[PDB]
Amino acid sequence: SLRANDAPIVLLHGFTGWGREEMFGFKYWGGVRGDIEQWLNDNGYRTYTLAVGPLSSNWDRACEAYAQLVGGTVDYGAAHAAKHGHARFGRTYPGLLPELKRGGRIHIIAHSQGGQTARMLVSLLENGSQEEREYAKAHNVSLSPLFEGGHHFVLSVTTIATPHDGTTLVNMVDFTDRFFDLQKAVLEAAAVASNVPYTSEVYDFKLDQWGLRRQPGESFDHYFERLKRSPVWTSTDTARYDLSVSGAEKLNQWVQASPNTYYLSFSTERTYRGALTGNHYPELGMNAFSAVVCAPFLGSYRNPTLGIDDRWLENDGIVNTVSMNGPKRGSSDRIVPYDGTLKKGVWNDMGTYNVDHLEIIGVDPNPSFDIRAFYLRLAEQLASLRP
Amino acid sequence: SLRANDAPIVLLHGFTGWGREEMFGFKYWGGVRGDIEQWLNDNGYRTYTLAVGPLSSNWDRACEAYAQLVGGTVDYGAAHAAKHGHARFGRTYPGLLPELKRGGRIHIIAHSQGGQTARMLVSLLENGSQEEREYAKAHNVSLSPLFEGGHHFVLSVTTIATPHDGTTLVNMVDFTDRFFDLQKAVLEAAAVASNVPYTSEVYDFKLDQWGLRRQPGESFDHYFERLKRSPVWTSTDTARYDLSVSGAEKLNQWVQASPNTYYLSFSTERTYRGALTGNHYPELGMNAFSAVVCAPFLGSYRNPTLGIDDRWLENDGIVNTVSMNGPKRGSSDRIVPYDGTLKKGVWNDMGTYNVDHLEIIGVDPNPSFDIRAFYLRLAEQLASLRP
Ligand SMILES: [Ca+2]
Ligand SMILES: [Ca+2]
Ligand SMILES: [Cl-]
Ligand SMILES: [Cl-]
Ligand SMILES: [Cl-]
Ligand SMILES: [Cl-]
Ligand SMILES: [Cl-]
Ligand SMILES: [Cl-]
Ligand SMILES: [Cl-]
Ligand SMILES: [Cl-]
Ligand SMILES: [Cl-]
Ligand SMILES: [Cl-]
Ligand code: NA
Ligand code: NA
Ligand code: NA
Ligand code: NA
Ligand code: NA
Ligand code: NA
Ligand code: NA
Ligand code: NA
Ligand code: NA
Ligand SMILES: [Zn+2]
Ligand SMILES: [Zn+2]
């Protein structure tokens, strides 16, 4: 295809994820398979990576993403920060693309919960926040340009394995403990132990707004026990809340597709349907943590009152596949199957791949999945988009 | 734990609550989770339910509980009735347990302000009322046995989420309108509308003494506007007066622990401490009415001169947690942390549970709280008490 835009690609992780220099250089985007950002740069697709709080709400992460792109000090909004009891200002960044203040566009490619954060960033850029604007006028405080509206610079959002209607994993009985055991399993993929008191930071959870940081001498085991009891686990201003079916529906009520952005979704599944009742079971080769800890639950949990039924049981080890083609619960967004022409302002469902939640970013091996081709094909499609 | 007594359990609601035939059978004790009295009976713990005026004083409610238990016409006392301007006599009941007049006893399990009513019932059984005794002699009128003193039929009182020292919620500026909105939120949890003039009674406020009742053609919205302007909201002979920190301390000056009764308290909390100034905020999953309307105030209102300081900020969405382990303000009662042996004549503090004020009775969902095991374990402990 012909190139029709010059927008760089920006990569955005989910409820785990870390910058290029973290985790001893093991990349979230490529894991044991390599460095996806480097593959794209090397093939002429200019690509950058964002690293935002993995456990923070999509709102917090969107404010962090905005400052990382345009430069400046993260501003969560005076109204938001007062309502949830955390700092209004966060870190200060130079900016990856401070030109976006003047003009120019990006493509966001986001995995897992990054797809919620990317959708939310577009809604804030284009429409701002009326609550923040009214609060700033009422209290005579400053207002970040993010909350003004009028700053739409995202040509496309592509989501990969995103829980747009949530994941039923949040409902599992031991979910608090098992979710932090999933963080430990991702550390272990990077050869990072959870019982070692690392002096270097290794994996920064970016919880400056809550005042939390792993302390000198503290193992990840000990630190996650503190995080389980902290506001980033127990408040509604969290990844945990937005990950749930309840909280993803609430997000979908206000975060709509912009008519100025192409949305693409990729769905993932790594399960088979059983012969007894319709439940789903992990396939050979699914990442071991998901296969043992998460997929049996995801493939069997129903909630008839919420209509969480047999269609929700197929999963990729972490998220129910039905959740991933676009927001539907609480959403008026349109979802169309890809027909060869990518359309603005709707979700173009690019299909369902037999790859698990961690294999699709290369964190878990899968030699039958040609991960480099997958990301290069996608970059060629995004470069074809007509602004 | 081996059973040591055969006393039945009697359940007692707070400033909302209704009998088993009210609310089209949606139970206060169990709500959306089921029927706690039925669970208890089906496991061999004989259990009954009281229904007294939700908005009436603890004194009125204790006279009503007395009559419902032993049988007969509610008698509020000639001196009390003349002092406050209401009828001396209320409804007539058949009596759930007339064997209490021949030696039978009960365990009361009480929620919310029910714990103040249960303590007041025990105080009146033990000591009566010298004012009533004086007045009956002076005016040559009859006297209820409740006011004589020298009676005993309560083996134990267990309080759950009770404001023994009051709740600061009453100091909210628009408390009147938000308290009746709480009543409407509880009706909505029971799938009852507030703008429909139901011909059946549905929720009887048992205001016979005040001469108030919902009229034909009157919705709950219109009825609650009248109640707000009526003596059951504007006088001192009300749940409103006894709910406040001021009124709870006045109650504690005369309602003391009996040496012949075990007292157990359960405390509840559903908040996190923020990172700005140590205020408390509602956790994810708190009932929506409390989370929006009540918890932000409860977690941020301080009054150092009245001793309302950091200890009062943690709360369950309706009552400050520090108020719930037993009466302290204006009280000489002893409170001891449970140590595996329950003690008579003192408050056995059974701990604090991460469950909100409505979750603890099942009116609001919380799948992580095993409400059936909670009540069954409590009934087994009460059955183990030595008589
Ligand atoms: Ca694999
Ligand atoms: Ca709840
Ligand atoms: Cl180190
Ligand atoms: Cl810390
Ligand atoms: Cl950290
Ligand atoms: Cl099956
Ligand atoms: Cl591989
Ligand atoms: Cl007994
Ligand atoms: Cl008694
Ligand atoms: Cl009337
Ligand atoms: Cl705070
Ligand atoms: Cl539940
Ligand atoms: Na505040
Ligand atoms: Na840290
Ligand atoms: Na499959
Ligand atoms: Na298949
Ligand atoms: Na929809
Ligand atoms: Na109904
Ligand atoms: Na808490
Ligand atoms: Na005291
Ligand atoms: Na819990
Ligand atoms: Zn926030
Ligand atoms: Zn009265």
* B212, two tokens: 């108030």
Q: How far is B32 from chain A (nearest CA, A)?
A: 12
- Which positions ≥6 away from B184 have C-beta within 8 Å? B194, B220, B221, B224
Residue B102 belongs to domain with CATH number: 3.40.50.1820
Query: Are B355 and B367 within 8 A, CB to CB?
Result: no
Residue span of the structural domain in which B191 resides:
1-387
Mutate to test the interface with A, among B33, B273, B276, B287 (most CBs of A within 10 A): B276
CA end-to-end span of chain B: 15
Collapsing DSSP to helix, strand or coil, A333 comes out as coil
Q: How far apart are CA B288 and CA B279, in angstroms?
A: 19
Chain B nearest-CA residue for A236: B284
- Helices within chain A (DSSP H only): 36-42, 58-70, 78-84, 114-127, 130-139, 175-189, 220-228, 231-234, 239-243, 245-254, 288-289, 295-298, 371-383
Q: Are strands B262-268 and B154-160 parallel, antiparallel or unpaired?
A: parallel
Query: Are B168 and B279 within 8 A, CB to CB?
Result: no
Q: Does A171 touch chain B (CB under 8 A)?
A: yes
> Across the interface, do B284 and A241 touch by the CB < 8 Å criterion?
yes
- Helices within B24-103 (DSSP H only): 36-42, 58-70, 78-84
Query: Are B208 and B244 within 8 A, CB to CB?
Result: no
What values do phi and psi take at A111, rounded to 5?
Answer: -110, 145
- Which positions ≥6 away from A100 have C-beta within 8 Å? A69, A70, A106, A153
- Which positions ≥6 away from B22 have C-beta within 8 Å? B51, B201, B202, B203, B204
Ion ligand 18: protein residues whose beta carbon lies under 5 Å: B 191
Q: How far apart are CA B288 and CA B276, in angstroms?
A: 24
Taking each helix axis from N to C end, the angle separating B58-70 and B114-127, rounded to the nearest 10 degrees, works out to 70
What angle is formed at CA B128 by the lines to CA B245 and CA B211, rounded to 5 degrees?
Answer: 70
Distances (CA, A) of A207 to A89, B158, B282: 12, 41, 19
- According to DSSP, the residues that pair with A75 across neighbouring strands are A89
Chain B nearest-CA residue for A209: B275
Count CA within 13 A, CB hemisphere, residue B187: 21
Our count of domains for chain B comes to 1
Q: How far apart are CA B262 and CA B158, in angstroms?
A: 8
> Across the interface, do A87 and B276 touch by the CB < 8 Å criterion?
yes
Q: Which amino acid is at A262?
A: Y
Q: Which of B269, B294, B295 is nearest to B356 (CA)?
A: B269
Collapsing DSSP to helix, strand or coil, B374 comes out as helix
- According to DSSP, the residues that pair with B92 across neighbouring strands are B73
Q: Does A284 touch chain B (CB under 8 A)?
A: no
Q: How far apart are CA B40 and CA B35, in angstroms?
A: 9
Q: Does B274 touch chain A (CB under 8 A)?
A: yes
- According to DSSP, the residues that pair with A272 across neighbouring strands are A281
What values do phi and psi take at B72, rounded to 5?
Answer: 120, -170
Residue in B274, B367, B368 closest to A85 by CB:
B274
* B167, two tokens: 């709740």
Q: What is the DSSP string of A28-75?
A: TTTGGG--HHHHHHHTT--EEE----SSB-HHHHHHHHHHHHH-EEEE
Q: Does B368 touch chain A (CB under 8 A)?
A: yes
- According to DSSP, the residues that pair with A359 across neighbouring strands are none
CA end-to-end span of chain A: 15
